[PDB]
């Protein structure tokens, strides 16, 4: 029906599960969907840890993003997800606050947000298209009241999907890999120069090379797995723009 009617970019998905039942459920949704970039919401460090724990346990590339974390971890975590070096990034409302994301593949909500606005704001800001703008809140039907008003104010309906019996969780493998270089602006890192360092000093191609996050302290450069393990290996004994720096491939 509405499908042909230019379906809405912001989809509202709801799943009934427990604080623990969400662990196996979330991963499953990522194994069956295989999203290029999924941002899981967490209320506290606990949830963020529990999620990443289960994911890493099976072999799912995940990463945590907090607001009280160190700049390094923040940039290293933001680049790992933005560059596509990871699969699931568990961040908080304060951590993923208007961050650098405008093409999220899916936004998983560990639990109903604080307000009906933020909830839609998260997915609404992260994306605003059909392919994107996916929001999946994991929580028992007890909080249905929150989704009832949230869906009403949005003039839309929610697809309360129930969890399956068994579980065929899979392992999501990264497609890229960021490189935490210790060059930064100090090493004269410009939006394009770093490219020559990898596509000139290392021997990588533009197809493998990804995004590059430059900073006044350090610089990050993405690289396809095809040349990820190599980029870091080469740089180890090389240098960018004639400057000996330290690289670190974000797993």
Q: Which domain holds residue 103?
A: 2-161
Cβ distance 174 to 84 under 8 Å? Answer: yes
Using what technique was this structure determined? NMR
C-alpha count within 13 angstroms, C-beta hemisphere, residue 244: 2
DSSP assignments along the chain, one per residue? -TTTTT--SSEEEEE---TTTHHHHHHHHHHHH--SSEEEE-SSHHHHHHHHHHHHHHT--EEEE-SSS-HHHHHHHHHHHHTTS-SEEEE-TTTSSS-S-S--SEEEESS--SSHHHHHHHHHHH--SSSS-EEEEE--GGGHHHHHHHHHHTT---EEEPPPSS-----PPPSEEEEEES-TGGGT--TTHHHHIIIIII---TTTEEEEEE-SS-EEEEEEHHHHHHHHHHHHTS-BTTB-----B--
| Residue 122 in tokens | 């998260």
CA contacts within 13 A on the Cβ side of 141: 6
Query: What's the burial of 19, exposed, middle or buried (CB within 10 Å: 0-12/13-18/19+)?
Result: middle
Residues found in the chain: 251
The values of phi and psi at residue 146, to 5°, are -65, -40
- For residue 130, the domain's CATH number is 3.40.50.300
């Amino acid at each position: 029906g509405g499908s042909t009617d230019a379906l809405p970019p912001i989809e509202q998905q709801f799943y009934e599960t427990s604080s623990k039942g969400k662990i196996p459920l979330l991963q499953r949704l990522l194994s069956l969907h295989q999203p290029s970039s999924c941002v899981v919401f967490c209320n506290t460090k606990k949830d963020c840890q529990a999620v990443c724990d289960a994911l890493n346990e099976v072999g799912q590339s995940a990463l945590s993003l907090h607001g009280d974390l160190e700049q390094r971890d923040r940039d290293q975590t933001l680049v790992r997800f933005a560059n596509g070096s990871a699969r699931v990034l568990v961040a908080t409302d304060v951590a993923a606050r208007g961050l650098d994301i405008k093409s999220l593949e899916l936004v998983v909500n560990f639990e109903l947000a604080w307000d009906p606005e933020v909830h839609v704001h998260r997915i609404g800001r992260t994306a605003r298209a059909g392919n994107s703008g996916l929001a999946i809140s994991f929580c028992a039907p007890e909080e249905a009241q929150r989704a009832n008003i949230i869906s009403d104010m949005l003039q839309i309906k929610l697809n309360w999907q129930t969890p399956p019996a068994n579980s065929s969780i899979a392992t999501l493998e990264a497609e890229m890999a960021t490189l935490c270089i210790d060059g930064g602006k100090k090493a004269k890192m410009r939006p394009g120069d770093v490219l020559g360092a990898l596509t000139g000093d290392i021997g990588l191609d533009g197809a493998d090379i990804g995004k590059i996050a430059v900073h006044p302290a350090h610089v990050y450069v993405a690289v396809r797995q095809a040349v990820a393990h190599k980029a870091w290996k080469q740089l180890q004994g090389g240098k960018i723009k004639g400057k000996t720096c330290r690289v670190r491939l974000l797993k």
